């Protein structure tokens, strides 16, 4: 009460001591209710600081008064800015040495309390109340402010704060009157979650049954069904437990904790963040197991007591998550894939590696909107670690399927380090098998990653067999797609591709006439179709080279300078009208090449060739083709005459087509 505080301060000043004498004006303004926040920063950080000679005289009086001002409910507003910032602005400016007397006036009956004895739990203390459930709430809010304002400097005051917070916590955990005990529980758990990473060197081993009674009794048999919505204070506590190296031995006391924590990951109706939170708890556990000599005191305990009997259920939950739902967040995907990345060099034997390899190749045949390429490189590292377990010999259809994926990601990636690790996962593939052949592919792609002289050496050595050839074809079309370092790489890749298709036309035996011909369709022909739109003229030249080699060597396959350029275009005109053509060839190879011919009598000759080909393609392609050309009209104001000449030629071809089809 402000009036009783004023009269009490008047009596304290009636005690006439020279320690209080120079500070009376600074004292009374704290009880004047309009100047409290200004008088606080007049007292501390002022020219009239408290002198350390009579600091011993003023500080008990001042701290009783500041305590009363922190208690008083009248002048304070609502919300946080009402009185929460007042408590914070007192405690943030108080010294850590005065804070002992501050908590001494804070804890009245709980000053000399003992929670733990030589035995486990003091039930005689716990079956009694010294404070009202109204009164413990302000205590816990104050100690939360004290800890959040102190930080490490709690180290000289460890022996009483933890007894207070533990007493209020276990009285709440016995009382599960609901609301006050519930808020007592939640704010005490927040205070403890701060206090743990406040104090690393304090000894937490004389009590373990208290964490047991705080955890295993109310929650754990229902904990994922509860935590399906949002992160809680128990999870906030287990997080800094997983972060601290001496607190991870609290998770071993009940064996079923980590089962329920990954069962939370198993429940699919969770709102993504409790999932990534449990995922982060697991990240911290595996990082602590991988840490050096500091965490090696309990490394063996977490290795042999926590993760080793629950590897199987961990992989089962991650498998159900990755194969179950149709909608997976990118944050959960990247974080869980990073957990499997860090968890793979921890397991030596396990049970569900067949499943996990099939999961990795499923997530690598996933598209690019669902899975990032950085995430694909992390699943590559997953492949690199999981492949060396002796598993691919049985279930050989799985092993051919993952080899289809390792080959498929060679032309996909654009990063040197990812291609290095790709060469490594193919190396341990080769160590696990056929074996000489995959080792030959290994040395080939190895000196492909290797710099320009070793690269051309690789190209020449490969220049000098189906599953042998397929990864070389994928990385070879990638080495087509590079424009130039000196221009030599695309030429060498084109010559190697010519060697490959020469081997294909060398094999015309019928059960391989199925396989090699399906390969040279599905891998090589859309590669040439997509590389037709490449703006580099040397890349267009080399794709022209391999396509001319294909037409010259193949033909039994059913699906197949200025003046010389004009001459070849006229011969292509005549060849068109003599033989109409294949429509997908016309749509996806010749038109963008001639478009590039225009946009780098060449232009009119090009429009003549497109006006020839528009008769030979089909209207369903022509619809979107014409729409792309009007898109060129509206998007390109740079060559209006050229695009409109092209349009006039195409509509003359349109009227020709309709007049023929009548």
């Amino acid at each position: 009460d402000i009036e009783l505080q004023k009269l009490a301060l008047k009596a304290i000043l009636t005690w006439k001591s020279e320690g209080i004498k120079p500070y009376q004006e600074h004292l009374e303004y704290l009880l004047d209710e309009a100047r409290f926040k200004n008088e606080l920063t007049v007292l501390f950080q002022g020219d009239n600081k408290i002198l350390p000679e009579h600091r011993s005289e003023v500080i008990p009086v001042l701290l009783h008064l500041l305590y009363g001002r922190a208690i008083s409910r009248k002048g304070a507003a609502s919300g946080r800015h009402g009185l929460h910032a007042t408590r914070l602005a007192i405690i943030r400016q108080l010294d850590v040495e005065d804070m002992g007397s501050f908590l001494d006036i804070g804890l009245g009956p709980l000053r000399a309390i003992r929670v733990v004895d030589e035995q486990g739990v003091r039930e005689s203390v716990f079956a009694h109340e010294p404070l009202p459930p109204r009164k413990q709430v302000g205590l816990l809010n104050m100690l939360e402010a004290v800890i959040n304002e102190l930080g490490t400097s709690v180290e000289p005051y460890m022996d009483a704060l933890v007894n207070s917070v533990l007493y209020c916590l276990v009285n709440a955990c016995r009382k599960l009157n609901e609301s006050l005990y519930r808020v007592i529980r939640t704010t005490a758990l927040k205070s403890l979650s701060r206090l743990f990473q406040n104090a690393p060197d304090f000894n937490w081993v004389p009590y373990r049954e208290l964490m047991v009674k705080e955890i295993i009794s109310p929650r754990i048999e229902k904990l994922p069904v509860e935590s399906t919505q949002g992160v809680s204070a128990t999870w906030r506590l287990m997080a800094t437990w997983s972060s601290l190296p001496k607190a991870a031995p609290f998770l071993n006391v009940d064996k079923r904790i980590l089962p329920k924590i990954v069962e939370t990951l198993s429940i699919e109706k969770a709102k993504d963040e409790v999932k990534v939170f449990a995922l982060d708890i697991l990240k911290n556990l595996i990082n602590l197991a991988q840490a050096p000599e500091t965490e090696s005191q309990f490394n063996e305990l977490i290795k042999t007591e926590l993760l080793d009997p629950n590897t199987d259920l961990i992989l089962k939950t991650i498998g159900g998550v990755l194969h179950g739902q149709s909608d997976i967040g990118r944050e959960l995907l990247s974080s869980a894939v990073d957990t499997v990345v860090v968890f793979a060099p921890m397991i030596e034997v396990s049970s569900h590696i067949q499943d996990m390899l099939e999961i990795a190749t499923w997530l690598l045949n996933q598209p690019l909107r669902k899975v990032n390429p950085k995430v694909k490189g992390a699943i590559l590292l997953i492949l690199k670690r999981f492949i060396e377990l002796d598993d691919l010999q049985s279930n050989q259809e799985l092993q051919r399927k993952v080899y289809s994926t390792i080959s498929a990601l060679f032309g996909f990636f654009k990063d040197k380090q990812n291609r290095q690790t790709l060469a490594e996962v193919l190396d341990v593939f080769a160590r696990r098998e056929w074996a000489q052949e995959v080792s030959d592919i290994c040395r080939g792609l190895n000196s492909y990653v290797e710099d320009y002289n070793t690269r051309l050496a690789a190209f020449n050595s490969i220049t000098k067999t189906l599953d042998q050839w397929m990864p070389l074809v994928h990385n070879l079309l990638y080495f087509i797609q590079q424009p130039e370092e000196f221009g030599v790489l695309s030429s060498n890749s084109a010559d190697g591709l010519c060697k490959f298709i020469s081997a294909v036309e060398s094999v015309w035996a019928t059960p391989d006439q199925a396989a090699w011909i399906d390969v040279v369709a599905n891998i090589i022909l859309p590669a040439i179709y997509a590389g037709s739109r490449d703006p580099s003229e040397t890349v267009r030249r080399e794709i022209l080279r391999v396509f001319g080699f294909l037409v010259s060597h193949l033909p039994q396959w059913e699906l197949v300078a200025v003046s010389r350029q004009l001459q070849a275009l006229r011969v292509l005109e005549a060849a068109n009208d003599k033989r109409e053509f294949r429509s997908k060839h016309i749509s996806q190879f010749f038109i963008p090449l001639f478009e590039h011919f225009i946009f780098d009598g060449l232009s009119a000759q090009a429009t003549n060739t497109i006006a020839a080909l528009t008769l030979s393609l089909e209207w369903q392609q022509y619809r979107a083709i014409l729409r792309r050309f009007i898109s060129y009209v509206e998007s390109k104001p740079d060559w209006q005459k050229r695009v409109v000449r092209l349009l006039e030629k195409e509509v003359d071809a349109l009227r020709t087509a309709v007049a023929s089809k009548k």
Partner: protein, 174 residues
């Protein structure tokens, strides 16, 4: 006599003009507030629309933003270091906007050792630019004033960090 009209000055073509009209209350401009360092002396001015603006003439403390970490604290104001406009404000210690002034560092130091825990100025996310670390070892940081003290009644602002900190150290050396 202090006003805001343009009737006394010459035109764009270089001509003066008579154009004599009396000074009006919407051309009103009041006398400047040289906000200095002292205890709090603020006078409240009522203005058009009945709206109050707080003319602060002597100020002690304001809150300053160490916002790269996420805090702002109320600290006192020691003395103005440099001012980009005038030298007389540097001489007579006048708090205006865009004034670089040195402030106390104790609540920022307290919040650093309270949140992170590694002490400062006496793992990897707690990281301090070594120039700013020298300011913390001095116990007196170089803040800059972003609030108008005359037309709001408080001298608040953000702390200098990085390139602006080095720029105003070089300008102090100038």
């Amino acid at each position: 006599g202090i006003s805001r009209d343009s009737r006394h000055k010459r035109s764009h073509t270089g001509a003066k003009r008579a154009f004599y009209r009396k000074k009006r209350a919407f051309e009103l401009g009041r006398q400047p507030a040289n906000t200095r360092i002292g205890p709090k002396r603020i006078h409240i001015v009522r203005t058009r629309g009945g709206n109050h603006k707080y003319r602060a003439l002597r100020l002690d403390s304001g809150n300053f933003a160490w916002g790269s970490e996420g805090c702002t604290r109320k600290t006192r104001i020691i003395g103005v270091v440099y001012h980009p406009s005038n030298n007389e404000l540097v001489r007579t210690n006048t708090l205006t906007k865009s004034a670089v002034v040195q402030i106390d560092a104790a609540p920022f130091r307290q919040w650093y050792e309270a949140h992170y825990g590694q002490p400062l100025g006496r793992a990897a996310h707690g990281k301090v630019d070594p120039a700013l670390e020298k300011q913390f070892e001095a116990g007196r940081l170089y803040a800059i004033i972003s609030s108008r003290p005359g037309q709001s009644g408080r001298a608040d602002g953000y702390i200098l960090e990085g390139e602006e900190l080095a720029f105003y150290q070089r300008k102090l050396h100038k």
